[PDB]
Amino acid sequence: GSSGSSGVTTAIIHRPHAREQLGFCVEDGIICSLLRGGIAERGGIRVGHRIIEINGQSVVATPHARIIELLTEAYGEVHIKTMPAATYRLLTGQ
């Protein structure tokens, strides 16, 4: 691609199996720890960043509980949109 708007980080997780862990630990819609040598790292998951959208679904105002049910339902090609709470907030602060 040519038109690139550097801003929100987008990662892609490869979940070939359902009975397989994820590696990345999410807390209140915000990743904290990441499994070393797993998928998250491969896809593009980085702790500290907050989740605002998943599999094409706005979860910025969605309760973790649900977020989990969603991500889980999404297998194989999972699109997780990560964003730094700092920037996001500052953006939607005005």
JSON list of C-alpha atoms in Angstrom, two decimals:
[
{"chain": "A", "resi": 1, "resn": "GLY", "atom": "CA", "xyz": [0.00, 0.00, 0.00]},
{"chain": "A", "resi": 2, "resn": "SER", "atom": "CA", "xyz": [0.95, 3.65, -0.47]},
{"chain": "A", "resi": 3, "resn": "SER", "atom": "CA", "xyz": [-1.59, 5.60, 1.58]},
{"chain": "A", "resi": 4, "resn": "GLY", "atom": "CA", "xyz": [-0.56, 4.92, 5.17]},
{"chain": "A", "resi": 5, "resn": "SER", "atom": "CA", "xyz": [-2.01, 6.79, 8.14]},
{"chain": "A", "resi": 6, "resn": "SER", "atom": "CA", "xyz": [0.37, 6.10, 11.02]},
{"chain": "A", "resi": 7, "resn": "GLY", "atom": "CA", "xyz": [-1.75, 6.17, 14.17]},
{"chain": "A", "resi": 8, "resn": "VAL", "atom": "CA", "xyz": [-3.56, 3.06, 15.39]},
{"chain": "A", "resi": 9, "resn": "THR", "atom": "CA", "xyz": [-1.62, -0.20, 15.66]},
{"chain": "A", "resi": 10, "resn": "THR", "atom": "CA", "xyz": [-3.29, -3.25, 14.11]},
{"chain": "A", "resi": 11, "resn": "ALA", "atom": "CA", "xyz": [-2.17, -6.82, 14.78]},
{"chain": "A", "resi": 12, "resn": "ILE", "atom": "CA", "xyz": [-3.29, -10.15, 13.34]},
{"chain": "A", "resi": 13, "resn": "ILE", "atom": "CA", "xyz": [-3.44, -13.29, 15.49]},
{"chain": "A", "resi": 14, "resn": "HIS", "atom": "CA", "xyz": [-3.32, -16.74, 13.90]},
{"chain": "A", "resi": 15, "resn": "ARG", "atom": "CA", "xyz": [-5.63, -19.10, 15.80]},
{"chain": "A", "resi": 16, "resn": "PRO", "atom": "CA", "xyz": [-5.58, -22.37, 13.81]},
{"chain": "A", "resi": 17, "resn": "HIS", "atom": "CA", "xyz": [-6.99, -24.25, 16.80]},
{"chain": "A", "resi": 18, "resn": "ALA", "atom": "CA", "xyz": [-9.67, -23.46, 19.38]},
{"chain": "A", "resi": 19, "resn": "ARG", "atom": "CA", "xyz": [-8.24, -25.59, 22.19]},
{"chain": "A", "resi": 20, "resn": "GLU", "atom": "CA", "xyz": [-5.09, -23.44, 22.09]},
{"chain": "A", "resi": 21, "resn": "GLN", "atom": "CA", "xyz": [-4.12, -20.62, 24.45]},
{"chain": "A", "resi": 22, "resn": "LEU", "atom": "CA", "xyz": [-3.67, -17.02, 23.30]},
{"chain": "A", "resi": 23, "resn": "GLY", "atom": "CA", "xyz": [-0.45, -15.99, 25.03]},
{"chain": "A", "resi": 24, "resn": "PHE", "atom": "CA", "xyz": [-1.43, -12.37, 25.61]},
{"chain": "A", "resi": 25, "resn": "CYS", "atom": "CA", "xyz": [-3.16, -11.52, 28.89]},
{"chain": "A", "resi": 26, "resn": "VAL", "atom": "CA", "xyz": [-5.85, -8.84, 28.77]},
{"chain": "A", "resi": 27, "resn": "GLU", "atom": "CA", "xyz": [-7.02, -6.92, 31.84]},
{"chain": "A", "resi": 28, "resn": "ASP", "atom": "CA", "xyz": [-10.05, -4.62, 31.75]},
{"chain": "A", "resi": 29, "resn": "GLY", "atom": "CA", "xyz": [-9.62, -4.35, 27.99]},
{"chain": "A", "resi": 30, "resn": "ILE", "atom": "CA", "xyz": [-5.92, -3.59, 28.33]},
{"chain": "A", "resi": 31, "resn": "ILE", "atom": "CA", "xyz": [-3.09, -6.04, 27.66]},
{"chain": "A", "resi": 32, "resn": "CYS", "atom": "CA", "xyz": [-0.58, -6.40, 30.49]},
{"chain": "A", "resi": 33, "resn": "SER", "atom": "CA", "xyz": [1.59, -9.48, 29.95]},
{"chain": "A", "resi": 34, "resn": "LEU", "atom": "CA", "xyz": [2.53, -11.35, 26.78]},
{"chain": "A", "resi": 35, "resn": "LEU", "atom": "CA", "xyz": [3.53, -15.00, 26.34]},
{"chain": "A", "resi": 36, "resn": "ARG", "atom": "CA", "xyz": [7.15, -15.17, 25.18]},
{"chain": "A", "resi": 37, "resn": "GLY", "atom": "CA", "xyz": [7.46, -17.01, 21.88]},
{"chain": "A", "resi": 38, "resn": "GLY", "atom": "CA", "xyz": [3.76, -17.19, 21.13]},
{"chain": "A", "resi": 39, "resn": "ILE", "atom": "CA", "xyz": [1.24, -15.76, 18.67]},
{"chain": "A", "resi": 40, "resn": "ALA", "atom": "CA", "xyz": [0.53, -12.31, 20.11]},
{"chain": "A", "resi": 41, "resn": "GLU", "atom": "CA", "xyz": [4.14, -11.25, 19.53]},
{"chain": "A", "resi": 42, "resn": "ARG", "atom": "CA", "xyz": [3.88, -12.61, 15.99]},
{"chain": "A", "resi": 43, "resn": "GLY", "atom": "CA", "xyz": [0.60, -10.86, 15.22]},
{"chain": "A", "resi": 44, "resn": "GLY", "atom": "CA", "xyz": [1.65, -7.55, 16.72]},
{"chain": "A", "resi": 45, "resn": "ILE", "atom": "CA", "xyz": [0.39, -7.44, 20.29]},
{"chain": "A", "resi": 46, "resn": "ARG", "atom": "CA", "xyz": [2.20, -5.15, 22.73]},
{"chain": "A", "resi": 47, "resn": "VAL", "atom": "CA", "xyz": [1.41, -4.74, 26.43]},
{"chain": "A", "resi": 48, "resn": "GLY", "atom": "CA", "xyz": [0.36, -1.29, 27.61]},
{"chain": "A", "resi": 49, "resn": "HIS", "atom": "CA", "xyz": [-1.92, -0.69, 24.64]},
{"chain": "A", "resi": 50, "resn": "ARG", "atom": "CA", "xyz": [-5.69, -0.68, 25.19]},
{"chain": "A", "resi": 51, "resn": "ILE", "atom": "CA", "xyz": [-8.27, -2.42, 23.01]},
{"chain": "A", "resi": 52, "resn": "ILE", "atom": "CA", "xyz": [-10.75, -0.25, 21.13]},
{"chain": "A", "resi": 53, "resn": "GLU", "atom": "CA", "xyz": [-11.91, -2.68, 18.44]},
{"chain": "A", "resi": 54, "resn": "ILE", "atom": "CA", "xyz": [-11.80, -6.39, 17.64]},
{"chain": "A", "resi": 55, "resn": "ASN", "atom": "CA", "xyz": [-12.77, -8.54, 14.65]},
{"chain": "A", "resi": 56, "resn": "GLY", "atom": "CA", "xyz": [-14.38, -5.35, 13.38]},
{"chain": "A", "resi": 57, "resn": "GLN", "atom": "CA", "xyz": [-16.35, -4.60, 16.53]},
{"chain": "A", "resi": 58, "resn": "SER", "atom": "CA", "xyz": [-16.09, -1.46, 18.67]},
{"chain": "A", "resi": 59, "resn": "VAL", "atom": "CA", "xyz": [-15.30, -2.59, 22.21]},
{"chain": "A", "resi": 60, "resn": "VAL", "atom": "CA", "xyz": [-14.00, 0.74, 23.51]},
{"chain": "A", "resi": 61, "resn": "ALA", "atom": "CA", "xyz": [-17.04, 0.92, 25.79]},
{"chain": "A", "resi": 62, "resn": "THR", "atom": "CA", "xyz": [-17.52, -2.84, 26.05]},
{"chain": "A", "resi": 63, "resn": "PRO", "atom": "CA", "xyz": [-16.98, -4.73, 29.34]},
{"chain": "A", "resi": 64, "resn": "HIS", "atom": "CA", "xyz": [-14.03, -7.13, 29.41]},
{"chain": "A", "resi": 65, "resn": "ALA", "atom": "CA", "xyz": [-16.46, -9.98, 30.10]},
{"chain": "A", "resi": 66, "resn": "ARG", "atom": "CA", "xyz": [-17.96, -9.57, 26.63]},
{"chain": "A", "resi": 67, "resn": "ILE", "atom": "CA", "xyz": [-14.64, -8.73, 24.97]},
{"chain": "A", "resi": 68, "resn": "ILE", "atom": "CA", "xyz": [-13.49, -12.21, 26.01]},
{"chain": "A", "resi": 69, "resn": "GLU", "atom": "CA", "xyz": [-16.56, -13.91, 24.53]},
{"chain": "A", "resi": 70, "resn": "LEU", "atom": "CA", "xyz": [-15.93, -12.08, 21.26]},
{"chain": "A", "resi": 71, "resn": "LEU", "atom": "CA", "xyz": [-12.19, -12.65, 20.80]},
{"chain": "A", "resi": 72, "resn": "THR", "atom": "CA", "xyz": [-12.82, -16.30, 21.65]},
{"chain": "A", "resi": 73, "resn": "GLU", "atom": "CA", "xyz": [-15.56, -16.64, 19.04]},
{"chain": "A", "resi": 74, "resn": "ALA", "atom": "CA", "xyz": [-13.06, -15.28, 16.52]},
{"chain": "A", "resi": 75, "resn": "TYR", "atom": "CA", "xyz": [-10.79, -18.07, 15.29]},
{"chain": "A", "resi": 76, "resn": "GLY", "atom": "CA", "xyz": [-8.08, -18.30, 12.65]},
{"chain": "A", "resi": 77, "resn": "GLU", "atom": "CA", "xyz": [-7.57, -14.79, 11.29]},
{"chain": "A", "resi": 78, "resn": "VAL", "atom": "CA", "xyz": [-8.24, -12.55, 14.29]},
{"chain": "A", "resi": 79, "resn": "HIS", "atom": "CA", "xyz": [-7.98, -8.78, 13.83]},
{"chain": "A", "resi": 80, "resn": "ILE", "atom": "CA", "xyz": [-7.18, -6.99, 17.09]},
{"chain": "A", "resi": 81, "resn": "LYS", "atom": "CA", "xyz": [-7.04, -3.19, 16.95]},
{"chain": "A", "resi": 82, "resn": "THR", "atom": "CA", "xyz": [-4.75, -1.91, 19.71]},
{"chain": "A", "resi": 83, "resn": "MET", "atom": "CA", "xyz": [-4.36, 1.72, 20.76]},
{"chain": "A", "resi": 84, "resn": "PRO", "atom": "CA", "xyz": [-2.48, 3.63, 23.50]},
{"chain": "A", "resi": 85, "resn": "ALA", "atom": "CA", "xyz": [-4.95, 4.83, 26.13]},
{"chain": "A", "resi": 86, "resn": "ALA", "atom": "CA", "xyz": [-2.90, 8.03, 26.27]},
{"chain": "A", "resi": 87, "resn": "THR", "atom": "CA", "xyz": [-3.31, 8.98, 22.61]},
{"chain": "A", "resi": 88, "resn": "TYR", "atom": "CA", "xyz": [-6.88, 7.69, 22.34]},
{"chain": "A", "resi": 89, "resn": "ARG", "atom": "CA", "xyz": [-8.02, 9.68, 25.37]},
{"chain": "A", "resi": 90, "resn": "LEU", "atom": "CA", "xyz": [-6.16, 12.80, 24.26]},
{"chain": "A", "resi": 91, "resn": "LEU", "atom": "CA", "xyz": [-7.80, 12.40, 20.86]},
{"chain": "A", "resi": 92, "resn": "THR", "atom": "CA", "xyz": [-11.33, 12.05, 22.23]},
{"chain": "A", "resi": 93, "resn": "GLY", "atom": "CA", "xyz": [-10.56, 14.57, 24.96]},
{"chain": "A", "resi": 94, "resn": "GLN", "atom": "CA", "xyz": [-11.41, 17.80, 23.14]}
]
